[PDB]
Ligand binder design. Structure first.
Ligand SMILES: COc1cc2ncnc(N[C@H](C)c3cccc4ccccc34)c2cc1OC
Length: 472
């Protein structure tokens, strides 16, 4: 019948793997264009380059997430095999015309070429164009992958495929060369005790708190904007090959660790109580400027530092902090309460520019990865859970909508370098250092009923803050 006629027009399974009938044993949809819930790698590839209709949403999500279930080298091989479609044999009337010496009719072959081979091959090139344009990192990481792609794209003889090879060749040309401006007047760079150039005197209390907040916001904005979606998929930042797969993500996390621990270090290594109060007060001022700038990443780094085991227990220090600053810390902490309800409402209400709290995306992605299975079972056969990947991809999409928000703030190279080079842990491991920090906390403020000892001053310069109002 017509169902068999439609199927038998496609190539046979002994010579082509991407043309078997769809069943519950190899592909399932959710509930227009149907959304793919799960399937085999073969069926995913077929639907990635489906002949009847274009599916740009599935292409975007596939190329973002595929590394969680398929290697880059394996993906190339599959789209090559998908491209290399075998043509059906001519009919008996047509076949005899060849050995006689005459041109056949070839109506079934022309229709197959028109409505299958050409459409499928068109979609494969669209995937290649999307791959090189939006995920070039794969090709620069694995040089052999690029040679194969260039070799494949080089050997595509076609009239209708001429524009696609030209466009794909244009992008690799740009990406090869890509290896090697304010709208308003930025405010004047602020200084306090440390002079411009005197980099050896740079410190928490010697730099201006306004400028610490500005330079950290510029730094963190750049780090936030550098993170690519694929770095977050499949928990690849916690796997063995984390440094190659998730370098921008790891830079973000390590900065957060180093800044947070540096705040804690600054506090507990200031053993004199009155000096430690000035240190804590200055960090709260830094948070106030983070809040002015809508650098929520920054705000919650300060909250983390203040809520840490060595700092949160310093009752004698926080007694001397003015109620106004206590309230600022309370309201900052309140952002995180009830699954970040207040934070999320604040982030949606504001206009650009901002730096979103990065930690929440990592938390939610880790929950999705751990909470959903890697594969679904149907009739004994395991199928790749694509909905799991799409949910992770949807979270990385939220990250991307805040990645084009540059600040109207001038960089200070020396202050930038200071914060880029922070190494509060030194040559200690993290657990060792955080044990040291808590042991330091116990020394400076012993647990009751032990007495509170006095300690000498370490700072020879004035501790009064210049405040957080900028000059004008
Ligand atoms: C559920 O337990 C908590 C409730 C909190 N409620 C409000 N704020 C917190 N943290 C802020 C950042 C903060 C830190 C340290 C000293 C502060 C002193 C006065 C005002 C705020 C302080 C909280 C922290 C908690 O555990 C860590």
């Amino acid at each position: 019948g017509a169902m068999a006629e439609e199927q038998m027009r496609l190539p046979s399974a002994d010579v082509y793997r991407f043309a078997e009938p769809d069943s519950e044993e190899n592909i399932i949809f959710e509930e227009g264009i149907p959304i793919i819930k799960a399937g085999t790698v073969i069926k995913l590839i077929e639907r990635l380059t489906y002949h009847m209709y274009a599916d740009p949403n599935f292409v975007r999500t596939f190329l973002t997430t595929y590394r969680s279930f398929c290697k880059p080298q394996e993906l190339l091989s599959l789209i090559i095999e998908r491209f290399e479609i075998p043509e059906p044999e001519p009919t008996e009337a047509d076949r005899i015309a060849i050995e006689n010496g005459d041109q056949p009719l070839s109506a079934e072959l022309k229709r197959f070429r028109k409505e299958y081979i050409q459409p499928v091959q068109l979609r494969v090139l669209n995937v290649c164009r999307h791959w090189v344009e939006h995920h070039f990192y794969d090709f620069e990481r694995d040089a052999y992958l690029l040679q194969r792609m260039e070799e494949f794209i080089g050997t595509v003889r076609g009239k209708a495929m001429k524009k696609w090879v030209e466009s794909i060749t244009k992008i690799i040309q740009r990406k090869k060369i890509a290896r090697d401006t304010f709208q308003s007047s930025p405010p004047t760079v602020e200084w306090h005790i440390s002079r411009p150039g005197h980099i050896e005197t740079f410190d928490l209390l010697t730099l201006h708190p306004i400028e610490i907040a500005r330079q950290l916001t510029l730094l963190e904005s750049d780090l936030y904007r550098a993170v690519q979606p694929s770095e977050l998929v499949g928990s690849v930042w916690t796997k063995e090959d984390k440094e190659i797969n998730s370098p921008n993500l790891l830079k973000m996390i390590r900065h957060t660790t180093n800044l947070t621990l540096w705040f804690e270090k600054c506090i507990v290594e200031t053993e004199n109580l009155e000096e430690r109060v000035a240190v804590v007060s200055r960090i709260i001022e830094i948070l106030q400027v983070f809040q002015e700038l809508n650098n929520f990443n920054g705000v919650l780094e300060v909250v983390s530092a203040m809520n840490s085991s060595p700092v949160y227990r310093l009752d004698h220090t926080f007694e001397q902090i003015p109620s106004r600053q206590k309230k600022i810390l309370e309201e900052a902490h309140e952002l995180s309460e009830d699954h970040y309800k207040k934070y999320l409402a604040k982030l949606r209400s504001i206009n650009p520019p901002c730096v979103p709290f990065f930690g929440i995306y990592l938390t939610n992605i880790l929950k999705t990865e751990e909470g959903n299975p890697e594969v679904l079972k149907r009739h004994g056969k395991e199928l790749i859970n694509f909905s799991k990947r799409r949910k992770v991809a949807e979270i990385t999409g939220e990250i991307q909508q805040y990645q084009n928000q540059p600040y109207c703030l001038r960089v200070e190279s020396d202050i930038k370098r200071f914060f880029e080079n922070l190494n509060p842990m030194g040559n200690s491991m993290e657990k060792e250092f955080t044990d040291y920090l808590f042991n330091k906390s116990l020394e400076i403020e012993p647990r009751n009923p032990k007495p509170l000892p006095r300690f000498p001053k370490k700072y020879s310069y004035p501790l009064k803050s210049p405040g957080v109002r900028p000059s004008n």
